[PDB]
Design a binder for this molecule. Structure first.
Ligand SMILES: Cc1cc2nc3c(=O)[nH]c(=O)nc-3n(C[C@H](O)[C@H](O)[C@H](O)COP(=O)(O)OP(=O)(O)OC[C@H]3O[C@@H](n4cnc5c(N)ncnc54)[C@H](O)[C@@H]3O)c2cc1C
Ligand SMILES: Cc1cc2nc3c(=O)[nH]c(=O)nc-3n(C[C@H](O)[C@H](O)[C@H](O)COP(=O)(O)OP(=O)(O)OC[C@H]3O[C@@H](n4cnc5c(N)ncnc54)[C@H](O)[C@@H]3O)c2cc1C
Ligand SMILES: O=S([O-])[O-]
Ligand SMILES: O=S([O-])[O-]
Ligand SMILES: O=S([O-])[O-]
Lengths: 394, 394
């Protein structure tokens, strides 16, 4: 097989890069290890930044999002029994975020790629990368009993945290930065109406809690739990009871509870690798970094990495400026680090950390009061929450 | 679930450690991601060091090996049209190597573990390690639709190069050492009798070639090929013709050719991580290192890592000397590096490297002539080939 850009992974990153490349007239092939239904089987929510929304539109995959997506002009943080609203729209001059699940976004992308007939090979096993530092790199994989080869000009590793692309880079060239948090998120998806039309991030002595929604008909709640907790030890009633206990009475009072469609505990971790490329190989999304869920920036960083790579690829193919691709990592990393910083900040002010002393507890409460009670503080949250502007190339 | 030593991976490393632990009265559980047939489906040859043979016997799994194994007292290296034999037995004082495939060894171990009823969980998905730096580490995994937890005292990561154990160690604590060779090994397994009763490593201007055997009824041959070669471009007749061209006429003359039962191209690489442990987690085998095939030391290093870990575990459980486990990496690494050194040496004197000048070519030929024509040189090869003595703990 022969293509211009080989894409490893058919998740959000890979699908979005490929559709953008498709519309731009740049040949591309996506190799996915799992099956279409397997990828679609991963149920993930989502809070899309303006930048990602624009990118999806530019990709020609926004019809369903515009119809089913939920535009939020604000977000709330609860602490000390009070609800403090951050007017994102007003504080940013008009920017908003759109609540539309990653599952739906992935589905939309798969339908668009399937419809245009772009190349995608599902169940592509034993993917291996070759000659990355040459001008003729290629990928090998095994599908339906045979060994196939894919020659290309560039390779985009969009294969997630456990993909093969990051592992195909000599460890001596990479620098890893990571952090694991002393707690996880117990989540519960329900078909009951949300307790609020905007998300509610809550800080409470017993621990963190979040009131959100996956769609107009699906509610999603979370409560902080220690790392050793067993989802099985948490019945729906125990979850509802703990959740209400971490929210202001006015909110817990009008909350509608119901049987859980799904429940699980997710860890919170940070991971960043530098650089994010090697020769003709470029990493994007989870293959290059992980952020804690607190900022809902994971899906958004995947989008921005793809935007940068896509824009740099155009420069290479349409202006013979392939040298600019060398700046891919530095550009992405500047945004990735700010996103890691903001997620870290949100996580630190909202969660209960073990063995924390009186001073730390007081400082945390003061962080919330200062930031939510100051226009400048409110602005720092707003601009970060809606997403910082994508850095223009060069 | 509760056990004393949790073992990730049911390949040679894991199975051997578990059987040794089983006989010693130390509780252990093996978690394997694939199915029994899947593991057994990997057809691998083998040249066992005296040390590994003894270990298998100590494990009580040597009956079939003693019956079907092929004891070799020597090995040959061909170059400049001549066959030079290295009398391993004589040069080492009585040590030999046993030709018995990893597939057979794995089968023997699985039958022994299955018979004694030791615990093994196949198809254990999403294996995850926890609290490694505590005194109560545990493993989580999903089997047959449910989330299970395994509490233990120690965890042995025997999950291969792409396992989860090495990835469960903070990258900031590890140092990676690696090298990739500019060529691969095109192999062909046949049911024809071997051209020789002892292996023949051959150096030839056209490239490296190896005459070996997987069993008394299966022959195994290899020829060096560039990294970009396609197994499909190599018909059996082309392989046989190239093979004979790299061997002395007397050998190529009496070689029996036949249809290939299997054919593939394998890359040659080296990989070592330091340290090989973190808290209560200890890596063994491919999860910690990779050596090129040239020395046939891969399976043997797996064996020695397991021997060291097993012996250190006994010290901990029977003498309250658990502090000695801290020396696990340093002991294994000293042997791993010498094995990497010897494999590197064998690879460098037997293969044709690209863009090599006249001086390099001459030096290589001289390396072979000096080492094969000197008793001291012959001894260095012999002691390394049969395997250096396992370092006693402390
Ligand atoms: C339970 C959970 C909930 C989350 N919820 C949110 C949320 O609400 N909001 C948010 O912003 N973030 C959230 N995240 C993170 C977010 O889902 C990721 O950032 C996003 O999936 C990254 O997309 P990606 O395409 O880069 O990687 P992935 O989605 O992981 O996709 C990578 C693809 O590559 C494939 N692949 C892997 N290895 C290979 C190989 N060797 N060869 C070929 N293909 C391969 C995979 O099968 C997969 O399809 C959540 C994560 C989890 C685990
Ligand atoms: C084609 C080929 C031929 C070779 N021929 C030889 C030879 O002739 N001689 C020689 O000495 N060496 C040879 N080697 C190398 C040798 O086979 C290895 O050194 C040996 O397999 C190492 O054994 P191990 O148990 O440590 O790892 P493995 O054999 O890889 O076993 C690891 C096990 O862990 C499982 N696992 C992986 N991830 C997970 C997870 N997340 N959870 C649970 N389980 C998991 C795997 O499924 C597997 O069963 C060859 C290698 C290849 C690829
Ligand atoms: O094969 S490479 O690293 O150009
Ligand atoms: O899909 S697996 O076994 O990485
Ligand atoms: O959980 S740890 O790293 O002890």
């Amino acid at each position: 097989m022969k293509t211009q850009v080989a894409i490893i992974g058919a998740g959000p990153s890979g699908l979005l890069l490929g559709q953008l490349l498709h519309k731009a007239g740049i040949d591309n092939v996506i190799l996915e290890r799992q099956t279409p239904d397997y990828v679609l089987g991963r149920i993930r929510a989502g809070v899309l930044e303006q930048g990602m929304v624009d990118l999806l539109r530019e990709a020609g995959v926004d019809r369903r999002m515009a119809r089913d997506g939920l535009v939020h002009e604000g977000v709330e943080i609860a602490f000390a029994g009070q609800r403090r609203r951050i007017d994102l729209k007003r504080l940013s001059g008009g920017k908003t975020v759109t609540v539309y699940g990653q599952t739906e976004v992935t589905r939309d992308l798969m339908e668009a790629r399937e419809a245009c007939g772009a190349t995608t090979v599902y169940q592509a096993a034993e993917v291996r990368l070759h000659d990355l530092q040459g001008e003729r790199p290629y990928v090998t994989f095994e599908r339906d009993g045979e060994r196939l080869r894919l020659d290309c000009d560039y390779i985009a590793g969009c294969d997630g945290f456990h993909g093969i692309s990051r592992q195909s880079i000599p460890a001596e060239r990479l620098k890893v930065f990571e952090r694991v948090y002393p707690f996880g998120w117990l989540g519960l998806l329900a078909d009951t109406p949300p307790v609020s039309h905007e998300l509610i991030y809550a800080n409470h002595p017993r621990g963190f809690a979040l009131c959100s929604q996956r769609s107009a008909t699906r509610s999603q709640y979370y409560v902080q739990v220690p790392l050793s907790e067993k989802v099985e030890d948490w019945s729906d009633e125990r979850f509802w009871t703990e959740l209400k206990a971490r929210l202001p009475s006015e909110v817990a009072e009008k909350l509608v509870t119901g049987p859980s469609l799904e429940k699980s505990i997710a860890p919170l971790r940070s991971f960043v690798v530098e650089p994010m490329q090697h020769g003709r190989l470029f990493l994007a999304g989870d293959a290059a970094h992980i952020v804690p869920p607190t900022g809902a920036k994971g899906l958004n960083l995947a989008a921005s990495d793809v935007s940068t790579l896509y824009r740099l690829l155009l420069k290479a193919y349409r202006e013979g400026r392939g040298e600019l691709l060398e700046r891919y990592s530095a550009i992405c990393l500047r945004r990735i680090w700010k996103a890691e910083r903001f997620s870290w900040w949100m996580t630190s002010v909202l969660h209960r950390f073990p063995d924390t002393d009186a001073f730390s507890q007081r400082i945390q409460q003061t962080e919330l009061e200062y930031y939510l009670g100051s226009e400048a503080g409110l602005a720092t949250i707003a601009e970060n929450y809606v997403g910082l502007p994508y850095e223009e190339i060069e």
